[PDB]
Ligand binder design. Sequence first.
Ligand SMILES: Cn1cnc(Cn2c(=O)nc(Nc3cc4cn(C)nc4cc3Cl)n(Cc3cc(F)c(F)cc3F)c2=O)n1
Ligand SMILES: Cn1cnc(Cn2c(=O)nc(Nc3cc4cn(C)nc4cc3Cl)n(Cc3cc(F)c(F)cc3F)c2=O)n1
Lengths: 299, 297
Amino acid sequence: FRKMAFPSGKVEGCMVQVTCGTTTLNGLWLDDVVYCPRHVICTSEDMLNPNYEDLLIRKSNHNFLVQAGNVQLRVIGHSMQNCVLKLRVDTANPKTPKYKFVRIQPGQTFSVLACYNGSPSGVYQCAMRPNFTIKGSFLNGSCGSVGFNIDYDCVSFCYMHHMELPTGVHAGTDLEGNFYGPFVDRQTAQAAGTDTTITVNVLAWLYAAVINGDRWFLNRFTTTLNDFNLVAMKYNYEPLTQDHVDILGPLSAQTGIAVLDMCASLKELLQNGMNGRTILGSALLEDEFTPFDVVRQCS
Amino acid sequence: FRKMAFPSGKVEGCMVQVTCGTTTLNGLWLDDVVYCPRHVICTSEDMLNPNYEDLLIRKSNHNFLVQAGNVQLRVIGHSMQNCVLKLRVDTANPKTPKYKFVRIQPGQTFSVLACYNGSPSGVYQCAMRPNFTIKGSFLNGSCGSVGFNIDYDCVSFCYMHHMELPTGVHAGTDLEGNFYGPFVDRQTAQAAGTDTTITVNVLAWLYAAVINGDRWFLNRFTTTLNDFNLVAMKYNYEPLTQDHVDILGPLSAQTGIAVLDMCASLKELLQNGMNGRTILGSALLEDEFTPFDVVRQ
Ligand SMILES: Cn1cnc(Cn2c(=O)nc(Nc3cc4cn(C)nc4cc3Cl)n(Cc3cc(F)c(F)cc3F)c2=O)n1
Ligand SMILES: Cn1cnc(Cn2c(=O)nc(Nc3cc4cn(C)nc4cc3Cl)n(Cc3cc(F)c(F)cc3F)c2=O)n1
């Protein structure tokens, strides 16, 4: 049982480089439009406190250099949608997959294709944190890298990377240009709200552990949904809804362990700790696998 | 630090399905050859103790169903090299990347493109364990999935998945069909040897911690390589090779910490533990990041 990302080929064929003067980052080329963070129009000076409508009115199509590998794509139009710039180009991307733009909710996972200067570099799985950050692996030049899910050859794009916060976590937008979380696309120090643990995901991962043979944390105690949620809230865990209980149904059926019985196991782990033991080789309770992630990798 | 895979697109374009009768698995289509585990020629009654030479003689080109998606690739020649079947097909794959076949050492990492029925499903990073297994994530139908590294647009293929062992770890071959480890391609219970910790990779992880400013474990001692190797084996750690010392060179240079001084720091951690302290936010020493992985990040 590993963190597993979707195959990245359908997205690799869409990555391009976008340059404005000295400023360069990654863009996403779908049909005849390139999507990228609007931060690209900023000079070093502009970055600290940009007025984007002002900066963009002073721009012309020919100010934008879009490179797909070695081939330059000519910009024939541009517009801004919130924090995303849309560059219309005179060529359609022949590698454009079937795709959709989606806004995900906290706790949901996605694959990240980290890119630098328009070239893909690596792929890994992430989760939208409850405080709307992501704990990614991004370096300088990764701005504009995207996160996505794939279902039946349709790529659902959900994240476009913008910035690293002082704590090392990451902030970005959906592909409509709206930030996840209370952040803005300005180079100034920004903190996130206090984060919490994604409870339904921890439970899914405990089920993964049982499916893979690690059972030491199970017990014969039990709990009600409300009494579990009281303890969860005490420990900065997200509440578990009846919808979450329903979504864990397939894993409870496969393992014969009722959801509220797994909740009682988690309650004990929160109250007692792991006593130096590990679960799926982890010394800490992992919360970045969804119930669907576990079902897909174990079935 | 987390495990990151290489982008998988160059390998996705090479995955195909190979079927013999009802036995079906994944193959790798490069130029006009498809590579796949020879186990595919086993009927369910042959899988226990197959006579592969006798099974191959009964086979003709037209017995092999090779499919890219739903498109059949006509087989024009077939041969067996060690544990891999090589099916020559009448179409050169237009998506063939620049590639080579390499045989890796324990501790080396690679990306796995897990596939089912010729269809890529997921990608993740893996390390070759000292006992020549990999702690992968594979289901039924994954036979023939490959592992690879990418360096400057060249794909180095290093693993072809064959089987799951009773302990849940996985065993396979290089792309010349030679198994990693003392395994054979028969559906018989084979136990993996006792595993050990990948010392060169733990050392890389310590350098990564130093680079990020976490350096409490740097002690005032040094050691010789022979001295360290003898101590390491008493803690179930792998001995270091001359090649290992060399691949730590870049990280040693970047930090200014001699390899042998870092060995002495590791030795102290093996003989005393960590005393509640963590390294890179982890109470456990990570051994599946190579020195290349560390610099890669
Ligand atoms: C360490 N790290 C992790 N993720 C990131 C992402 N990231 C980034 O790749 N680039 C940024 N600033 C730029 C500087 C440039 C210098 N040149 C020549 N061109 C540049 C282009 C960019 Cl985008 N930033 C900072 C940043 C990016 C934003 F989109 C934003 F709204 C505010 C910010 F402070 C950055 O975080 N780096
Ligand atoms: C749970 N798991 C994790 N990895 C694996 C890999 N694996 C596999 O995918 N298939 C195997 N046997 C087959 C059965 C088939 C049934 N049909 C209809 N077609 C089949 C094709 C195969 Cl390959 N095996 C077992 C196995 C495969 C070998 F290549 C080998 F040499 C020995 C073995 F015991 C398998 O491990 N499953």
